[PDB]
Design a protein around this ligand. Structure first.
Ligand SMILES: Nc1nc2c(ncn2[C@@H]2O[C@H](COP(=O)(O)OP(=O)(O)O)[C@@H](O)[C@H]2O)c(=O)[nH]1
Ligand SMILES: Nc1nc2c(ncn2[C@@H]2O[C@H](COP(=O)(O)OP(=O)(O)O)[C@@H](O)[C@H]2O)c(=O)[nH]1
Ligand SMILES: [Mg+2]
Ligand SMILES: [Mg+2]
Lengths: 288, 290
């Protein structure tokens, strides 16, 4: 179908704008869509990983340096490898926490669209699950509600991805599967005090918002850094357990991600996505 | 004399408290003190790097899992290797962002003490410099000021080192090479001037650039190529990536060579007891309710 990705939402001087040439494309796509989005801190291997879902080396473009690379949000519409008659829609996001940009508001808008447009949301981090991440995920989650405001589940399913993973998956003595880890980290605290409650308040809203959760670890894809010629490498050349792990991740998405859905049940196709995108983007550029 | 570290500030159920048996010790030490602290997200190889300043293996203890390890603040006193008649004091901190704890105001207190007790403050992070980091650094910085109050061009604010761990990426920008320092000042570079959201930027980059006089940055390549990472207290330098050895050596050399003597305001040099009594002052100052 589509040979490479194109920018869906442009990001210039803190204005987010739909790119009309993508809407023109969405608007022609009649099949239902599974939508996968990914976000995380910047320089964190997101675009590389998205590309593995499209089963191509080279697509969403990479960038090698300390400078951020992906700006705005890029979509890529491809045939669904495992659900005949569906399109897979990949969303690649500008990474959070650019110091070049120094703009948390803007971060939050992008984060929010991702969650809003997606039927599987993919939060990417390096090494550990981390409270500053928890936090932000909560904040954006609440934000999402407030955006739906202007204008049997349809909230997206969730995946945490852990990169360059090093540490023993172990805790309080006993082994952990990546999923036991992720629920360890949303594990509510006994009962009440009021700081027993401070806690919980994020963990609750997160356990509620995302029906399905899943988690995957990933070893460094290469032992030195020949880490920068990565658009170019086969799979011999990579650490085999990274290839194992990727494969596992792709199979989960292909086999579990659901068809994107509006409220009241209707399945989202091209034009229904086009219309969301406008709706949500128009909502952001007006008055809270 | 001091053979291994010792908890200086206990952290139990969200109340921090000085450890008497460690003041008893400080109270006996009468040489001047260079103080180096380190903080950063948890599980980030802080305690390891810290041992390197003491030139030992084994010392501050490590932990190899996803759970956090170092709790409170550990101190460790030792000769200074370059500055005769001084003591080097090392301060290893509880890492930030523990999901088990889920408690930022506790984080912040601990951040804040490190900054307060130190003459060289070392901020440790994985991979990149990163706005949520700079943000937090700013927040604490302006928290520092507030704690100092609750206690009444030639200055006594700590010097600053950013440490970047498991560093992968090209040090390159806008087309032109970068040294680790050029990176750090790249990140604190002020925006051209005028307008509003121009000055919402800037506002943290200002306070940092004022607060910390000297600034330095160091990169650090993953110690080992597999993950025999997890025994590490017990590997000799042959067995490590020899560019990480290089880099540790270079960072040690800077600390030893450049970290100043810790100083009260009005100029007095800090020794054992004057630390004992800073620790107490700052710790009591946190146990009221601002
Ligand atoms: N250390 C590390 N680097 C990676 C990984 N995956 C990709 N990279 C490299 O990190 C750089 C930026 O990749 P990218 O996907 O653009 O990061 P993004 O900004 O999150 O999109 C590229 O040189 C990638 O080859 C990884 O899993 N670990
Ligand atoms: N990936 C990685 N691991 C490290 C590095 N340095 C130490 N480690 C390992 O990370 C684990 C935790 O070390 P530690 O210093 O206690 O982390 P801390 O929580 O920040 O104190 C140990 O297994 C260390 O051997 C590093 O530079 N990179
Ligand atoms: Mg990218
Ligand atoms: Mg530690």
């Amino acid at each position: 179908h589509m040979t490479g990705p194109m920018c869906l939402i442009e990001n210039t001087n803190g204005r987010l704008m739909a790119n009309p040439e993508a809407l023109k494309i969405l608007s022609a796509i009649t099949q239902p869509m599974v939508v996968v989005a990914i976000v995380g801190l910047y320089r964190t291997g997101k675009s590389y990983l998205m590309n593995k879902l499209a089963g191509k080396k080279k697509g969403f473009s990479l960038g090698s340096t300390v400078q951020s690379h992906t700006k705005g949000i890029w979509m890529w519409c491809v045939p669904h490898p495992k659900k005949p008659g569906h399109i897979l829609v990949l969303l690649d996001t500008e990474g959070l926490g650019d110091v070049e940009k120094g703009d948390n508001q803007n971060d939050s808008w992008i984060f929010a669209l991702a969650v809003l447009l997606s039927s599987t949301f993919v939060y990417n981090s390096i090494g550990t699950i981390n409270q500053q991440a928890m936090d932000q995920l909560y904040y954006v989650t609440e934000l999402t509600h407030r955006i739906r405001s202007k204008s049997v589940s349809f909230f997206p399913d969730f995946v945490w991805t852990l990169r360059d993973f090093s540490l023993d998956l172990e805790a309080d003595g006993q082994p952990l599967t990546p999923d036991e880890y992720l629920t360890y980290s949303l594990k509510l605290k006994k009962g009440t005090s009021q700081k027993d409650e401070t806690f919980n308040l994020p963990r609750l809203c997160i356990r509620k918002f995302f029906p399905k959760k899943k988690c995957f670890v990933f070893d460094r894809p290469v032992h030195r850094r020949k880490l920068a010629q990565l658009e170019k490498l086969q799979d011999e050349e990579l650490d085999p357990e990274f290839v194992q792990q990727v494969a596992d991740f792709c199979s989960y998405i292909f086999s579990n991600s659901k068809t994107k859905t509006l409220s009241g049940g209707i399945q989202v196709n091209g034009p229904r996505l086009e219309s969301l995108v406008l709706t949500y983007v128009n909502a952001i550029s007006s008055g809270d």
